[PDB]
Amino acid sequence: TSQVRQNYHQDSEAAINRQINLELYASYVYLSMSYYFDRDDVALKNFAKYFLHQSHEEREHAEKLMKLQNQRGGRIFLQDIKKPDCDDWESGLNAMECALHLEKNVNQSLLELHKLATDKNDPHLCDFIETHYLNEQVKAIKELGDHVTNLRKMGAPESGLAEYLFDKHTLG
Amino acid sequence: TSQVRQNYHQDSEAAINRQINLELYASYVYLSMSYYFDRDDVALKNFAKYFLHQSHEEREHAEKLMKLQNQRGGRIFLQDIKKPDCDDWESGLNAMECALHLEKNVNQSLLELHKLATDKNDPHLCDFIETHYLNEQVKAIKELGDHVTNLRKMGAPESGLAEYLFDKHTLG
Amino acid sequence: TSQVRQNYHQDSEAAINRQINLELYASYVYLSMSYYFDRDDVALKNFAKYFLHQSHEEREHAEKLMKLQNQRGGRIFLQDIKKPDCDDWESGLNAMECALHLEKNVNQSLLELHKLATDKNDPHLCDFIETHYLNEQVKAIKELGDHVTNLRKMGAPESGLAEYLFDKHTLG
Amino acid sequence: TSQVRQNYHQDSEAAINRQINLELYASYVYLSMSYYFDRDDVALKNFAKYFLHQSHEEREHAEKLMKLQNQRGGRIFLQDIKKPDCDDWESGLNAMECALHLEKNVNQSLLELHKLATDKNDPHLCDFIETHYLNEQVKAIKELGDHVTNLRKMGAPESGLAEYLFDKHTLG
Ligand SMILES: [Cl-]
Ligand SMILES: [Cl-]
Ligand SMILES: [Cl-]
Ligand SMILES: [Cl-]
Ligand SMILES: [Cl-]
Ligand SMILES: [Cl-]
Ligand SMILES: [Cl-]
Ligand SMILES: [Cl-]
Ligand SMILES: [Cl-]
Ligand SMILES: [Cl-]
Ligand SMILES: [Cl-]
Ligand SMILES: [Cl-]
Ligand SMILES: [Cl-]
Ligand SMILES: [Mg+2]
Ligand SMILES: [Mg+2]
Ligand SMILES: [Mg+2]
Ligand SMILES: [Mg+2]
Ligand SMILES: [Mg+2]
Ligand SMILES: [Mg+2]
Ligand SMILES: [Mg+2]
Ligand SMILES: [Mg+2]
Ligand SMILES: [Mg+2]
Ligand SMILES: [Mg+2]
Numbered sequence: 153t154s155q156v157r158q159n160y161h162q163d164s165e166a167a168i169n170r171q172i173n174l175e176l177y178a179s180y181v182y183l184s185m186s187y188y189f190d191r192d193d194v195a196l197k198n199f200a201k202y203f204l205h206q207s208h209e210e211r212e213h214a215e216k217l218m219k220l221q222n223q224r225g226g227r228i229f230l231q232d233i234k235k236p237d238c239d240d241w242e243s244g245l246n247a248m249e250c251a252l253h254l255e256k257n258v259n260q261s262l263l264e265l266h267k268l269a270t271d272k273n274d275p276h277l278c279d280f281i282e283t284h285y286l287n288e289q290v291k292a293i294k295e296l297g298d299h300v301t302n303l304r305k306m307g308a309p310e311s312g313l314a315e316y317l318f319d320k321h322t323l324g
Numbered sequence: 325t326s327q328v329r330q331n332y333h334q335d336s337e338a339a340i341n342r343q344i345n346l347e348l349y350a351s352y353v354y355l356s357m358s359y360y361f362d363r364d365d366v367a368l369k370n371f372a373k374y375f376l377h378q379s380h381e382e383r384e385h386a387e388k389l390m391k392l393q394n395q396r397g398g399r400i401f402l403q404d405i406k407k408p409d410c411d412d413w414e415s416g417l418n419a420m421e422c423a424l425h426l427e428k429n430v431n432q433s434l435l436e437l438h439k440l441a442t443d444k445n446d447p448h449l450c451d452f453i454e455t456h457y458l459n460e461q462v463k464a465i466k467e468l469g470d471h472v473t474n475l476r477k478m479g480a481p482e483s484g485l486a487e488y489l490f491d492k493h494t495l496g
Numbered sequence: 497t498s499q500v501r502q503n504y505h506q507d508s509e510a511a512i513n514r515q516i517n518l519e520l521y522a523s524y525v526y527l528s529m530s531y532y533f534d535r536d537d538v539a540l541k542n543f544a545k546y547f548l549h550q551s552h553e554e555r556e557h558a559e560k561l562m563k564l565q566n567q568r569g570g571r572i573f574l575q576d577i578k579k580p581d582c583d584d585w586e587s588g589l590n591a592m593e594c595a596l597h598l599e600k601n602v603n604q605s606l607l608e609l610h611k612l613a614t615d616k617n618d619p620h621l622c623d624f625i626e627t628h629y630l631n632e633q634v635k636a637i638k639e640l641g642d643h644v645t646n647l648r649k650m651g652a653p654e655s656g657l658a659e660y661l662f663d664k665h666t667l668g
Numbered sequence: 669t670s671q672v673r674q675n676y677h678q679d680s681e682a683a684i685n686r687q688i689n690l691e692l693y694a695s696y697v698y699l700s701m702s703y704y705f706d707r708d709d710v711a712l713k714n715f716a717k718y719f720l721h722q723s724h725e726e727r728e729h730a731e732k733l734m735k736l737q738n739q740r741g742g743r744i745f746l747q748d749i750k751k752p753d754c755d756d757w758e759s760g761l762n763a764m765e766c767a768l769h770l771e772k773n774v775n776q777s778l779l780e781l782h783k784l785a786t787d788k789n790d791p792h793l794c795d796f797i798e799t800h801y802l803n804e805q806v807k808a809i810k811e812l813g814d815h816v817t818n819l820r821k822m823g824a825p826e827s828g829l830a831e832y833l834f835d836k837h838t839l840g
Pocket of ligand 11: 676677678679
């Protein structure tokens with residue numbers, strides 16, 4: 153047993169490894185979305201900037217969980233990072249809707265993680281999830297919801313003018 | 325023979341003189357496009373600014389090739405600079421499409437130049453073309469493609485509002 | 497066909513997508529190595545810092561290739577990022593030897609890419625690989641070779657003192 | 669009853685007084701360790717500095733719990749501060765191992781405190797423990813584990829050179 157390990161259930165250790173993989177998957181989804189908007193036939197540079205920033209944020213989320221695993225004396229086990237569900241994201245609105253779905257899936261995984269930590273009476277892990285992940289997810293979901301609303305109200309996806317002006321005024 | 329000349333084929337010398345003329349022609353096309361958007365019945369000042377900048381860039385491309393000709397001991401021979409294909413460029417979108425076609429023609433000429441330099445085993449000339457011209461062309465073509473895409477998506481040429489807002493937000 | 501595409505062979509496009517995946521795989525190997533040295537039973541913080549920096553560099557390599565794909569009018573196709581070959585990297589010396597092997601595999605892939613670009617007469621892609629990748633690989637391989645040499649000469653892996661002092665004096 | 673007291677169980681009040689005593693005891697252990705390394709026949713000044721800093725930290729932990737007791741309207745009751753288990757700490761490695769054991773005992777006490785606060789439905793006290801104590805303990809335990817690992821790998825306690833160089837390079 154690790155000399156540092158204390159009050160850290162094997163199920164929690166495994167769930168943290170699963171969450172590391174999910175955060176890396178989310179980084180990959182956002183990377184794919186970013187370079188879709190960099191295509192010469194899409195050409196929305198601030199959508200590309202926004203999703204690249206989100207991608208780098210998710211990698212930071214993954215690294216913090218790797219740090220946590222070692223802090224608690226668990227052992228990191230990595231799995232393949234699956235490619236994103238889509239290659240062509242269709243429109244700025246469709247990408248925003250996909251990101252909203254992704255962030256609500258990641259949130260559900262974090263809530264399941266917190267339920268496990270609660271069931272195993274691990275208050276340090278509960279506080280870690282609350283402090284560093286749960287409100288970040290609530291803010292991300294709210295921001296993406298706001299973006300989806302505005303794009304819909306402006307007339308996207310059919311209005312290429314709507315996505316152009318949203319790119320300039322909200323994401324610029 | 326020039327006291328500096330070494331490994332510089334006569335065919336390469338001639339091809340450089342042809343490329344000087346083509347760069348000056350491209351400068352002239354962009355100058356014509358610029359002042360079209362300065363007409364009181366067109367009146368898109370940032371299209372005019374953008375194409376004037378492109379025009380001055382092409383003159384710099386031509387001057388660098390003149391410098392290269394003398395560096396290698398070839399002799400500059402100048403020809404008439406032909407007037408651009410059009411007097412009236414119709415719309416911001418049409419001018420962007422014409423510039424895209426121009427830059428892909430200039431790129432093809434540079435690729436033919438590089439093939440000649442390769443066939444004559446002139447690595448200095450190959451490196452000159454690669455370093456100073458080929459990625460500049462790839463960037464220019466990509467930028468013009470992006471501009472054409474956005475103008476189309478926004479509803480140009482029919483939407484005078486589209487070209488107005490592109491002038492402000494992308495070229496401003 | 498993409499409006500920007502010119503002199504870009506379909507085989508080159510596919511080879512760039514394969515190289516994107518390889519750079520992301522290398523990012524993942526170095527991420528795994530980094531957090532191995534963050535374990536409480538390994539505890540070499542400057543090895544961990546060094547490999548995390550290398551990991552972020554590889555992600556930058558991947559992003560630049562994604563940018564290139566779009567610059568040339570190819571289409572990015574992503575694949576799963578395979579997990580690294582190992583979970584436990586055994587020692588600082590063993591991790592350095594694995595990184596040396598990785599970088600020489602990545603170099604071989606880049607050389608095959610350059611041979612393809614040469615065979616398809618794509619001087620822009622040749623210059624891209626030369627400018628942004630080939631000397632970076634030669635420098636990386638030389639640095640890792642130097643590190644392996646010093647660790648061996650100092651008495652690693654058996655000497656925990658050797659790896660400790662290398663961590664402080666070379667990687668600190 | 670105190671005019672401020674609300675939702676503060678008598679068992680929680682007593683457990684906080686016990687935790688005050690434990691934090692003061694930990695301050696005393698680290699003070700003793702510090703001046704052991706100040707002996708002329710031990711003479712490891714950075715071990716002495718490190719443990720004196722830890723000692724002052726524990727006194728700050730105790731004072732914050734005294735503040736909490738009064739914030740919630742409980743009444744501080746102090747007990748004797750027991751002398752540390754040892755007078756001679758033998759070596760830098762042995763002192764680090766003793767500190768690791770101490771911090772894992774203090775953590776266990778804090779986890780028992782949190783379980784009590786949870787059982788008494790005291791979310792303010794739960795949050796206090798999580799915010800100010802539980803991650804501090806996880807970080808302390810991880811740091812001490814790292815230090816023990818390095819000293820072992822370097823050849824301590826038998827190698828006086830190992831402890832000398834650790835004193836300079838890790839604790840300096
Ligand atoms: Cl367990
Ligand atoms: Cl519209
Ligand atoms: Cl559209
Ligand atoms: Cl000749
Ligand atoms: Cl309109
Ligand atoms: Cl109009
Ligand atoms: Cl082809
Ligand atoms: Cl030794
Ligand atoms: Cl060892
Ligand atoms: Cl030394
Ligand atoms: Cl009570
Ligand atoms: Cl010795
Ligand atoms: Cl000794
Ligand atoms: Mg995340
Ligand atoms: Mg699959
Ligand atoms: Mg030019
Ligand atoms: Mg004529
Ligand atoms: Mg690389
Ligand atoms: Mg596999
Ligand atoms: Mg070459
Ligand atoms: Mg304490
Ligand atoms: Mg006694
Ligand atoms: Mg709670």
